[PDB]
């Protein structure tokens, strides 16, 4: 064992020096005088009440009109974001849930929390009720996130270090991703559904391959736990948010850190990060009761989403870019535009 | 200005909101408690006594004087609790069971208790501290084979305070030792209470005729002090 660390350190710092040689110009210098986005004014259009406890996660539908949110009182509610009507309200078996996902096909919703179980609900069925279809129980840690791949494929992230690809029909995990050293907190799928990135409590982010169980790449730029990760619409870059008032941009090709979105006036820690449809705007939700708007190419604060009472927990931008939703711990969803 | 279908859409949303209101009644009339501690401490014995009288979360229900309590015991989970503890930010109280029989773990327990008390997401949350298996503690100390001063070399200098109120039938040696650990836990509790949360230690045992009643009286005090502080009275 003593003959391994000596050469592992040499390999690691070789990687480090090759990485240093790879980069030659800061992206801030490249995008130095192209265009400022200017001040951005966004205001509430609808406010969605009806959640008893606080809410942790929410996911936009693909039709850009429906969204689903999960609360600490054990409730899944599907909204009509146009007419504010409550399309569906689902009671959960476990009151502690930390994530929810909406299927791209629009007929499946999934949730899971401190029960180490990811449950699947089918919205459209011959009978007039939303019920459980499959209960994936193979983890030994709380589920931190989940994302649908198709109508029968899903990837889950657990408090247990492993990330697992599942198979709804057979109810068995096809592939297990074991590369981290702590608890994976978030995972963001690629637009082509071929390579997702996950962030953990070890300040490290890893790009994976769905076809096999191989960790393709690893990024380490932060010092605290990684709390939220998002993928750039182009599919060749991604931004993350950690518990040190900092957001960073990594490129899956250059393998560097491009910008550091932070300000001396911020002490709180990020909770959710999302991108605009064009990728020009970065939206980050903080713990100081309000979200923020960042210029993804100039690294400036160009907008604040002031209205919220408690800490924001989930943030998201709809597929067509019409609006951005925002949940928080005061149990109110606000659609901004 | 709405179609004949949107009228029935709004009607459905009203009956969703009506059912949510009915569910707000049960949610507001129940108190949620979180069990914590270590493996040696007889938490399973505690939950088995009330319940008779890779899941990762176990929930048990008990109600005394027509008010419902729900206790959530964390099941199969990893050692680290940094992340999933911020979720329990709205419980009324934490029930922190501790075993007093063996002396090696006591130092470990103080490390566990100190981190929970000083946590950022658990301020304004009071701890109903328990000391369990007290009968076995008496047996070990009266035998005298195992000393206390070897682990904590202050048992000799320290003397039982006048505030101690022991029942008849117990020698001073048991009372001197029993109240020594209780003050050790409180030594770190008083430092960071900061007029927000309070500790309510007890001296329960493995099997007890009544245990929930201690939680009832502590919970009533816990929120009575919260309301009084809220109305600028306390």
């Amino acid at each position: 064992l003593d003959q391994l660390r000596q050469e592992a350190e040499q390999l690691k710092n070789q990687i480090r020096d090759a990485r240093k040689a790879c980069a030659d110009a800061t992206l801030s210098q490249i995008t130095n005088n192209i265009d400022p986005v200017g001040r951005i004014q966004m205001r509430t259009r609808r406010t969605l009440r009806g959640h008893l406890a606080k809410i942790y996660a929410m996911h936009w539908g693909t039709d850009s009109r429906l969204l689903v949110s999960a609360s600490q009182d054990g409730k899944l509610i599907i909204w009509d974001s146009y007419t504010t009507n409550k399309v569906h309200a689902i009671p959960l078996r476990s009151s502690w849930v930390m994530t929810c996902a909406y299927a791209p096909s629009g007929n499946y919703v999934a949730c899971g929390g401190l029960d180490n179980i990811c449950s699947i609900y089918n919205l459209k069925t011959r009978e007039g009720n939303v019920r459980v279809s499959r209960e994936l129980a193979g983890h030994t840690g709380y589920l931190s996130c989940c994302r649908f791949l198709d109508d029968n494929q899903i990837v889950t992230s657990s408090g247990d270090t492993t990330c697992a690809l599942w198979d709804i029909e057979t109810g068995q995990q096809t592939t297990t991703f074991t590369g981290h050293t702590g608890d994976v907190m978030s995972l963001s799928l690629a637009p082509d559904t071929r390579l997702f990135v996950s962030g953990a409590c070890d300040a490290s982010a890893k790009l994976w391959d769905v076809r096999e169980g191989m960790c393709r790449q690893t990024f380490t730029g932060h010092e605290s736990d990684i709390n939220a990760i998002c993928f750039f619409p182009n599919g060749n870059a991604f931004a993350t948010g950690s518990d040190d008032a900092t957001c960073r941009l990594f490129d899956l090709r250059a393998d560097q850190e491009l910008m550091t979105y932070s300000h001396d006036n911020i002490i709180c820690g990020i909770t959710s990060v999302s991108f605009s449809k064009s990728g020009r705007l970065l939206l980050a939700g903080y713990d100081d009761f309000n979200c923020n708007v960042w210029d993804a190419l100039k690294a400036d604060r160009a907008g604040v989403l002031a209205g919220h009472d408690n800490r924001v927990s989930c943030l998201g931008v709809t597929d067509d870019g019409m609006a951005v939703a925002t949940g928080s711990w005061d149990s109110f969803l606000k659609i901004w535009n | 200005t709405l179609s004949a279908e949107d009228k029935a859409a709004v009607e459905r949303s009203k009956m969703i909101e009506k059912q949510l209101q009915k569910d707000k009644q049960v949610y507001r009339a129940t108190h949620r408690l979180l069990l914590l501690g270590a493996d040696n401490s007889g938490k399973s014995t505690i939950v088995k006594q009330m319940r008779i009288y890779t899941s990762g979360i176990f929930e048990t229900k008990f109600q005394v004087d027509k008010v419902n309590f729900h206790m959530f015991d964390v099941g199969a989970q990893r050692d680290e609790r940094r992340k999933w503890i911020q979720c329990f930010n709205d419980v009324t109280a934490i029930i922190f069971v501790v075993d007093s029989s063996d002396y090696n773990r006591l130092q470990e327990a103080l490390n566990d208790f100190k981190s929970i008390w000083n946590n950022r997401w658990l301020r304004t949350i009071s701890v109903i501290l328990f000391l369990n298996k007290q009968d076995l503690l008496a047996e070990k100390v009266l035998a005298g084979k195992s000393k206390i001063e070897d682990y904590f070399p202050e048992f000799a200098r320290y003397t039982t305070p006048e505030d101690a109120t022991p029942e008849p039938g117990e020698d001073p040696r048991v009372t001197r030792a029993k109240y020594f650990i209780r003050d050790e836990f409180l030594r770190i509790s008083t430092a960071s209470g900061d007029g927000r949360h309070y500790c309510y230690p007890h001296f329960t045992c493995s099997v007890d005729t009544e245990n929930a009643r201690r939680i009832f009286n502590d919970c009533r005090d816990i929120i009575q002090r919260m309301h009084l502080r809220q109305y600028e009275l306390l």
Partner: single-chain antibody
Amino acid sequence: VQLVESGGGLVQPGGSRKLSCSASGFAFSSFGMHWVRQAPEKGLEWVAYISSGSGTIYYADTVKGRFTISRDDPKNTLFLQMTSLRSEDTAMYYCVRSIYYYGSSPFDFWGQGTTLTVSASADIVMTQATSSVPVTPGESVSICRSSKSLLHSNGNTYLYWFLQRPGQSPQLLIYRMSNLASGVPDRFSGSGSGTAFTLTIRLEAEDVGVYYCMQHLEYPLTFGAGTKLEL
């Protein structure tokens, strides 16, 4: 999802009768319920409507005030009480379930009447152009009767296309003129111009039967005259 209808029988011209539609296999408490009449030798017409939870109730102006529609969720049964029957009310009755929310498909399940034979304005009219068109397997058949623009401000159309197999209950084919109902093959593409509509089909051997439409924009639900396809 299977609901049966009970009642019927020989009745006197002036008496009373009770009609029941007992639901089973679905969450009956979250479904609006309608009643639709179908004359022995004519088209189908609306009768009544009771919302889920009995919040709102409408009636047909033809027999308003002589009929009552009531629910029973505990027992999952629907009732219709008829008083002072006349010769016009002689037909077969269908209880049609429908649920209304974003993306729903109302009027999807009907259920056939079992021995349901009985004895003796500013609306929208949907008199279809034809009543019979020759059909052979291989060629499409299609034929718009709207007295008002069936296009609300939201963006929908509110035209439902039903098909009547010869000898049993109707079925839903297309709702809102562009949405194909579940459980039926490719029978329509999506085409309409606010006031003119058509239903283009390859014809198989089961398509024979009446083929009429409906309106849902305003409170009265007026059906089409009826188009038939024969081999």
